[PDB]
C-alpha cells in the first residue's frame, strides 16, 4: 500500500517530466499530471507516482483519470 515514487509526489515535478511529450498522444501534460501520472520520456508512456501503474497508447477521447482508475483499481490516488 506504499507510494511507489515519492520523488514524483509533487504535481509540479510530474508536470516538468513532460519535456518532449508527443503531439499524437492528444492528452495534455496538465491533465495527466493531475491524475497522478508523470512522463517516462519514452513514446506516450506514463506512470503513476502512487501505484506505479504504467499507461501507453493514449487515444483522443481517453480521460487520464478514467483510464488510470479502470486499469489500476488498487491505486489509492484515483480511488
Amino acid at each position: 500500500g506504499h507510494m511507489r515514487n515519492p520523488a514524483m509526489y509533487s504535481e509540479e515535478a510530474r508536470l516538468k517530466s513532460f519535456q518532449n511529450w508527443p503531439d499524437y498522444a492528444h492528452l495534455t501534460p496538465r491533465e495527466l499530471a493531475s491524475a497522478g501520472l508523470y512522463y517516462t520520456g519514452i513514446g506516450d508512456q506514463v506512470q503513476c507516482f502512487a501505484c506505479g501503474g504504467k499507461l501507453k497508447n493514449w487515444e483522443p477521447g481517453d480521460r487520464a483519470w478514467s483510464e488510470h482508475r479502470r486499469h489500476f483499481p488498487n491505486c489509492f490516488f484515483v480511488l
Binding site: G53, K54, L55, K56, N57, W58, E59, D62, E67, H71
Partner: peptide, 5 residues
C-alpha cells in the same frame, strides 16, 4: 490507453 509492465 493500455496498461503495461
Amino acid at each position: 490507453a493500455x496498461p503495461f509492465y
